[PDB]
PDB file of C-alpha atoms in Angstrom:
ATOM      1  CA  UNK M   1     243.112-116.116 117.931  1.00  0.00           C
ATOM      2  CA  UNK M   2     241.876-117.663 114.426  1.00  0.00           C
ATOM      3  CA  UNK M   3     240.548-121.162 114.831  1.00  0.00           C
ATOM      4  CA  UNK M   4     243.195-122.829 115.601  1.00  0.00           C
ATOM      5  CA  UNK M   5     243.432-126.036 113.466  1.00  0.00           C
ATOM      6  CA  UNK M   6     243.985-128.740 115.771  1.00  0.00           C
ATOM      7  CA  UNK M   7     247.095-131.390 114.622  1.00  0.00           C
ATOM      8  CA  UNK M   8     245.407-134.219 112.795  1.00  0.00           C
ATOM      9  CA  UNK M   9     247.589-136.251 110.299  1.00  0.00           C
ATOM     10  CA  UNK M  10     245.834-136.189 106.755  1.00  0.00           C
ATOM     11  CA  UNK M  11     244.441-136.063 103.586  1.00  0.00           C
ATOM     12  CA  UNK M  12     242.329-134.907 101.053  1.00  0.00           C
ATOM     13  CA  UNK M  13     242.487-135.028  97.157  1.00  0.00           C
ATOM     14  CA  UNK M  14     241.524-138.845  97.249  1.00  0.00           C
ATOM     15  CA  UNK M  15     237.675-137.911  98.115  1.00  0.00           C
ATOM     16  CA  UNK M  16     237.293-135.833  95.175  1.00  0.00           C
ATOM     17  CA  UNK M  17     238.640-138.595  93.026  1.00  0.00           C
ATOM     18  CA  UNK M  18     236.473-141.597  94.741  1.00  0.00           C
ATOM     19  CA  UNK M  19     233.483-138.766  94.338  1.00  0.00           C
ATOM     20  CA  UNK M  20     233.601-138.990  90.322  1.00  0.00           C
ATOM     21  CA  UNK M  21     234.484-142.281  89.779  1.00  0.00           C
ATOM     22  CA  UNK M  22     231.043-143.755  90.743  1.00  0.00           C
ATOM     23  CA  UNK M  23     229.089-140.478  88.994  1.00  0.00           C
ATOM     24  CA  UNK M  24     230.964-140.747  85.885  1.00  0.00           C
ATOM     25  CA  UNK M  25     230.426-143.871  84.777  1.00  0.00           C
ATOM     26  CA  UNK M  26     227.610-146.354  87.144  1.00  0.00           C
ATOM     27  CA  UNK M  27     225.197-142.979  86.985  1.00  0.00           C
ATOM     28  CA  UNK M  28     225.864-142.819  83.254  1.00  0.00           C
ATOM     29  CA  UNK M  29     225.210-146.247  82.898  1.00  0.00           C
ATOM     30  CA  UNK M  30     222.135-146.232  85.392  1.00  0.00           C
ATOM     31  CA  UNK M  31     221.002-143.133  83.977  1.00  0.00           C
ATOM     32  CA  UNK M  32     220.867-144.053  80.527  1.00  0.00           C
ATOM     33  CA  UNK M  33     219.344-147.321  81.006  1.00  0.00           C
ATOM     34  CA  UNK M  34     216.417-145.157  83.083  1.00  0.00           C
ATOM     35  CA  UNK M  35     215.616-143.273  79.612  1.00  0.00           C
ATOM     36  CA  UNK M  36     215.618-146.259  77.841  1.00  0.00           C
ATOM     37  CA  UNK M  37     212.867-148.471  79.400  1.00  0.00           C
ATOM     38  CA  UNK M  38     211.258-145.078  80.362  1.00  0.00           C
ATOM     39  CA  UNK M  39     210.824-144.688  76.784  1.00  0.00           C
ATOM     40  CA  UNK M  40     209.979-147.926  75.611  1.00  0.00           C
ATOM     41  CA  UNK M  41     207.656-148.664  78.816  1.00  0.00           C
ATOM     42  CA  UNK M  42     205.516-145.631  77.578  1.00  0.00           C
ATOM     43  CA  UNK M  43     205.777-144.851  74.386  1.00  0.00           C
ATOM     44  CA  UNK M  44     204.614-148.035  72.467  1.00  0.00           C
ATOM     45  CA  UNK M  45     201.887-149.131  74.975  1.00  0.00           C
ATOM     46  CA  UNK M  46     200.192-145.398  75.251  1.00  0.00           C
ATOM     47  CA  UNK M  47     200.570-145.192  71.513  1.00  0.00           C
ATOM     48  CA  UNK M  48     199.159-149.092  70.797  1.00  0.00           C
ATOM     49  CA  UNK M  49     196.682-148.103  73.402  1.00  0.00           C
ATOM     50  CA  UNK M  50     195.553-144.747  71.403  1.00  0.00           C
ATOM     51  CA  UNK M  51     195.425-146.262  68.280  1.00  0.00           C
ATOM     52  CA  UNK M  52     193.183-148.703  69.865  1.00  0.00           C
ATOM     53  CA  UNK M  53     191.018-146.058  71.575  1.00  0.00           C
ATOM     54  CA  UNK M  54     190.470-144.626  67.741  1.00  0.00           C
ATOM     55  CA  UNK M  55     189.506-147.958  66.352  1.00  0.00           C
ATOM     56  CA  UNK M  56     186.974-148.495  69.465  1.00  0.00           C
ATOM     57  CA  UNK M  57     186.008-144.726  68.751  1.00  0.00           C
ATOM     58  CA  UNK M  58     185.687-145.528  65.033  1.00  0.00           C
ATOM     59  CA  UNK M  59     183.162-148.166  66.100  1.00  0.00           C
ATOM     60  CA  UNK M  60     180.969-146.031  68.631  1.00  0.00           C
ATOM     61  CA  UNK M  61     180.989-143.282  66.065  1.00  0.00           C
ATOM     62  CA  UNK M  62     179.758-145.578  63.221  1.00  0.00           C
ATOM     63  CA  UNK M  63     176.888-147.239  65.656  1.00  0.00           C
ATOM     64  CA  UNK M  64     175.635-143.819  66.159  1.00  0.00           C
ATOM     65  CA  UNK M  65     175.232-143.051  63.052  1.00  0.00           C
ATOM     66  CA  UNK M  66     173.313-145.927  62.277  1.00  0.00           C
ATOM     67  CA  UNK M  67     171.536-144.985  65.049  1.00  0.00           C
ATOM     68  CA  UNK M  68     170.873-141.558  63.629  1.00  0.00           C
ATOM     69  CA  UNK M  69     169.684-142.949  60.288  1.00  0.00           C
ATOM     70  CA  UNK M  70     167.303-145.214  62.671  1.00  0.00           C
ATOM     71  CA  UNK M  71     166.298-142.624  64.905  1.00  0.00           C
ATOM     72  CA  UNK M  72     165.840-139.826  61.764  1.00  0.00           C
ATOM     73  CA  UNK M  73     163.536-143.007  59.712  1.00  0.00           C
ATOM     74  CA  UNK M  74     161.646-143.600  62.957  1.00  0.00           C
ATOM     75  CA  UNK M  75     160.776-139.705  63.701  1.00  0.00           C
ATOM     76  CA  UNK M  76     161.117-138.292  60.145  1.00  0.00           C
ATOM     77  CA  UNK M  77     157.444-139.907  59.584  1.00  0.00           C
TER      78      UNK M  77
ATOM     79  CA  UNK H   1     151.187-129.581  81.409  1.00  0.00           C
ATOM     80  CA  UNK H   2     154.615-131.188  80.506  1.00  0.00           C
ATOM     81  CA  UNK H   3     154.521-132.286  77.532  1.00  0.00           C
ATOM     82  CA  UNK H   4     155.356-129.422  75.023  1.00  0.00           C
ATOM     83  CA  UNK H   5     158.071-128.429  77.356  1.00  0.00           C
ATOM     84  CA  UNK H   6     159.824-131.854  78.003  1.00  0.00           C
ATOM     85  CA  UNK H   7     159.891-131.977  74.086  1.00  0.00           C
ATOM     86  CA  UNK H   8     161.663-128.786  73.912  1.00  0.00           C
ATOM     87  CA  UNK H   9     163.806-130.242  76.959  1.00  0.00           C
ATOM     88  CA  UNK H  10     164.790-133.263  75.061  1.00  0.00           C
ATOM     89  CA  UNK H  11     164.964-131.566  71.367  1.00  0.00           C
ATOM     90  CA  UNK H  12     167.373-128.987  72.930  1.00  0.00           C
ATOM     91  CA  UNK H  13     169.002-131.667  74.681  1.00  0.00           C
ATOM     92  CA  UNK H  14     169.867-134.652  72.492  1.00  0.00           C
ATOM     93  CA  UNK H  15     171.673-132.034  70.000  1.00  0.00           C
ATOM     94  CA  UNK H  16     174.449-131.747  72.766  1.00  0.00           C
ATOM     95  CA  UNK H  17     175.943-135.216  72.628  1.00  0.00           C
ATOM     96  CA  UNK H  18     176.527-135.251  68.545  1.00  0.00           C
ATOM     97  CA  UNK H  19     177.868-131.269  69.457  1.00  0.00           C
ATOM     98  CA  UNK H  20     180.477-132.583  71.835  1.00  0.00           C
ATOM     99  CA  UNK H  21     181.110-136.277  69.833  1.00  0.00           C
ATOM    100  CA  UNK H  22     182.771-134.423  67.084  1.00  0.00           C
ATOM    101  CA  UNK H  23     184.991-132.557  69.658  1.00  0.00           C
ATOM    102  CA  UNK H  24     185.848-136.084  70.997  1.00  0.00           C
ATOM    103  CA  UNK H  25     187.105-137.500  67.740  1.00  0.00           C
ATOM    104  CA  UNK H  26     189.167-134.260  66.658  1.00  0.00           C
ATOM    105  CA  UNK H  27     190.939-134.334  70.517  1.00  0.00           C
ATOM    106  CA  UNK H  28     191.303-137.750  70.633  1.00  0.00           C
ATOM    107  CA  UNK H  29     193.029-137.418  67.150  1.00  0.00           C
ATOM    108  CA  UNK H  30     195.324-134.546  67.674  1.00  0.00           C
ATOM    109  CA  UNK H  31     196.193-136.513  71.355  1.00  0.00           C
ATOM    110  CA  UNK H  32     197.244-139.106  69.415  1.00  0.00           C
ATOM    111  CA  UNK H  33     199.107-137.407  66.430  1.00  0.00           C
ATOM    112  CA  UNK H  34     201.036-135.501  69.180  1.00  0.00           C
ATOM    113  CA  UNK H  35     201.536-138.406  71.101  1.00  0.00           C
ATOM    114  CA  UNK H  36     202.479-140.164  68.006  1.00  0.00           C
ATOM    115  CA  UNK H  37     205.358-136.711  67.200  1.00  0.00           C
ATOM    116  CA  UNK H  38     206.588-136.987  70.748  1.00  0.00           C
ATOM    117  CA  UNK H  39     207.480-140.569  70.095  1.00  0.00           C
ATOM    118  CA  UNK H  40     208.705-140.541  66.211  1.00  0.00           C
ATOM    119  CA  UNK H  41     211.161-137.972  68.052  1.00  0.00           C
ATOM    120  CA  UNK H  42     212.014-140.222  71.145  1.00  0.00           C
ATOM    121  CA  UNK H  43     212.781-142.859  69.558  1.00  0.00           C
ATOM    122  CA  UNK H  44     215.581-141.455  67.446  1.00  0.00           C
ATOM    123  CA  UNK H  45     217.391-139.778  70.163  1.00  0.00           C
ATOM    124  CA  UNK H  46     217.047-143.265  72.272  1.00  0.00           C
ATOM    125  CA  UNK H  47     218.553-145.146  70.045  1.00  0.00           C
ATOM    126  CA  UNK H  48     221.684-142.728  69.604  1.00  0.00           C
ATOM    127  CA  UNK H  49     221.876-142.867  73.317  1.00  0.00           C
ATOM    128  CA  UNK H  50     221.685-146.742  72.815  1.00  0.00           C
ATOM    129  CA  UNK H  51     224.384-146.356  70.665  1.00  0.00           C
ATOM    130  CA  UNK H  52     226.414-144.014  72.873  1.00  0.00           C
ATOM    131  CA  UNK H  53     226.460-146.025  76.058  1.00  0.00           C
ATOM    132  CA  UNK H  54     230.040-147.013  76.505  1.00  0.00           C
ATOM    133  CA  UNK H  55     230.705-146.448  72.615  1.00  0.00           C
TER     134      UNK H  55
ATOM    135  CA  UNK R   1     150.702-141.397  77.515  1.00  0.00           C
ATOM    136  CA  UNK R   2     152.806-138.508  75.526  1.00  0.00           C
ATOM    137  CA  UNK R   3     155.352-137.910  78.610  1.00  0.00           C
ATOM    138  CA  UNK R   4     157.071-140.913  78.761  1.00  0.00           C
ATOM    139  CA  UNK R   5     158.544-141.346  75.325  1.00  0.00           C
ATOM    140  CA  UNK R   6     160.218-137.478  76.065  1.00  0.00           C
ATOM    141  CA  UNK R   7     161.202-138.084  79.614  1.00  0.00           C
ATOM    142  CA  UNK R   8     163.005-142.004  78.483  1.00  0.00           C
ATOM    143  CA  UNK R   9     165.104-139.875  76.362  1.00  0.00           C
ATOM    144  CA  UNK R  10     165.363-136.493  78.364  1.00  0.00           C
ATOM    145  CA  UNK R  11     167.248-139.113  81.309  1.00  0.00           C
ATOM    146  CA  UNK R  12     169.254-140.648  78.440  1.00  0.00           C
ATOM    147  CA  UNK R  13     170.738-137.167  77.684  1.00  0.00           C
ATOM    148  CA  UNK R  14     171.555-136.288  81.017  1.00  0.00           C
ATOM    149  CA  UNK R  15     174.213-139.270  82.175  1.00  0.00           C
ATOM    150  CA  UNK R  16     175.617-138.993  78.434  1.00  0.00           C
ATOM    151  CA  UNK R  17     176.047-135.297  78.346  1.00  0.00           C
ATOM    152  CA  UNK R  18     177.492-135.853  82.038  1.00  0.00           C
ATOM    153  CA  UNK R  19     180.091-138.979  80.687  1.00  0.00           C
ATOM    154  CA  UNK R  20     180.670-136.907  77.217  1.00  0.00           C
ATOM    155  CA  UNK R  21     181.968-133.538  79.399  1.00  0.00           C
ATOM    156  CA  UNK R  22     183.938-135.672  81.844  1.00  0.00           C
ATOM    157  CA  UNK R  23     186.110-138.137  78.925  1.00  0.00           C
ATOM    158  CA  UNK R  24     186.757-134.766  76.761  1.00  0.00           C
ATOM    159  CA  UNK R  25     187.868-132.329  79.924  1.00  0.00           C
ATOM    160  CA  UNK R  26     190.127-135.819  80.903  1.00  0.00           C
ATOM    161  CA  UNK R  27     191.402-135.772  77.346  1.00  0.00           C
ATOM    162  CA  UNK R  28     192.401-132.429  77.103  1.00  0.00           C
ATOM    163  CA  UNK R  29     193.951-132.904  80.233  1.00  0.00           C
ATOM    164  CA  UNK R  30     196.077-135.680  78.820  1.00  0.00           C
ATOM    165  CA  UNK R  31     196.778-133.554  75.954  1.00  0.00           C
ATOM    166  CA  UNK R  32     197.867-130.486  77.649  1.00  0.00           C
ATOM    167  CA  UNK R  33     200.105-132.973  79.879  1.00  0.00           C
ATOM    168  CA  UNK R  34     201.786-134.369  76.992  1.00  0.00           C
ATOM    169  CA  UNK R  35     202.620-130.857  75.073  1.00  0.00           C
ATOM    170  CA  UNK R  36     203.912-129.925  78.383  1.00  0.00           C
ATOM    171  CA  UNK R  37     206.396-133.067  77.991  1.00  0.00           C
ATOM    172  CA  UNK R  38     207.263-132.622  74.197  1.00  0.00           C
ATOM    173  CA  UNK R  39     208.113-128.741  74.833  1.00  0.00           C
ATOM    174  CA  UNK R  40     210.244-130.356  78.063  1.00  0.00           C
ATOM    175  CA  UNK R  41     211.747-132.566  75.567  1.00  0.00           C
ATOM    176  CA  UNK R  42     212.355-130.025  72.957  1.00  0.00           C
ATOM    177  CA  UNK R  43     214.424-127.810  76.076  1.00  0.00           C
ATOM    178  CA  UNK R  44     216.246-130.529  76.926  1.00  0.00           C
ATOM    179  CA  UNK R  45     217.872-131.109  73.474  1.00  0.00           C
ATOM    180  CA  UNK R  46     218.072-127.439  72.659  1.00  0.00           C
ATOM    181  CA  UNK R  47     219.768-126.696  75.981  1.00  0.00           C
ATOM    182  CA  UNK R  48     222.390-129.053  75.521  1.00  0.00           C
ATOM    183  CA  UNK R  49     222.809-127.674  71.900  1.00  0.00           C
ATOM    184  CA  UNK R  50     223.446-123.966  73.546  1.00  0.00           C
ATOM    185  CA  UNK R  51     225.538-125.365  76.476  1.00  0.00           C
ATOM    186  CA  UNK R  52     228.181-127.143  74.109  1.00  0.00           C
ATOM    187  CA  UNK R  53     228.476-125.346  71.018  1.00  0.00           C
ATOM    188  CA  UNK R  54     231.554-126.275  70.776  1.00  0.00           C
ATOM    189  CA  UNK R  55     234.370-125.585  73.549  1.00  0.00           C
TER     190      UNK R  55
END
């Protein structure tokens, strides 16, 4: 025989529903909030923090050059 | 007899830092211009999304 | 006498050209790793403008 299906009582159709009501609109919300302090967690710090890195490299890059004209009056004798 | 060739050692040597400084700075520059594209275009799209949370 | 003044300098290149190779392979590492995330970006908006497209 095919499987039988034993006598139960019910249901169905009410799943599906309770299934989308939480996706549709707590992910949305949960997801969207997510991007945004994703977005504002990394963006501004790494790009304060880069702009900083070329200021700092700005300084290193002018010491050595002083230290070039230093070195190149010391050895250029 | 070292001295000759530790002069040649450091001559050849001390040219390698300035070679790879100016690397450094053009990297670290384009990092940060891309860096600083990736977020000019972020930033737009969040706030639309900011926008069109629950209308 | 005329060693020391090369080999003072000929250690001072080594740790530098050592630090210098390690911050530029970590910054182009960082680099690559954010064009990665831009292009990801840039699929991510153009795939939702090719899945709507009107309906």
């Amino acid at each position: 025989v095919p499987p039988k299906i034993p006598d139960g009582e019910r249901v169905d159709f009410d799943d599906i529903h309770r299934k989308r009501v939480e996706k549709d609109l707590n992910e949305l919300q949960t997801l969207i909030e997510a991007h945004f302090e994703n977005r504002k967690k990394e963006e501004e710090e790494l790009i304060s923090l880069k702009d900083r890195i070329e200021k700092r490299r700005a300084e290193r890059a002018e010491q050595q050059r002083i230290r070039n004209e230093r070195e190149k009056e010391r050895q250029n004798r | 007899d070292k001295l000759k060739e530790a002069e040649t050692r450091a001559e050849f040597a001390e040219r390698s830092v300035t070679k790879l400084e100016k690397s450094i700075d053009d990297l670290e520059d384009e990092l940060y211009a891309q860096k600083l594209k990736y977020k000019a275009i972020s930033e737009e799209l969040d706030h639309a999304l900011n926008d069109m949370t629950s209308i």
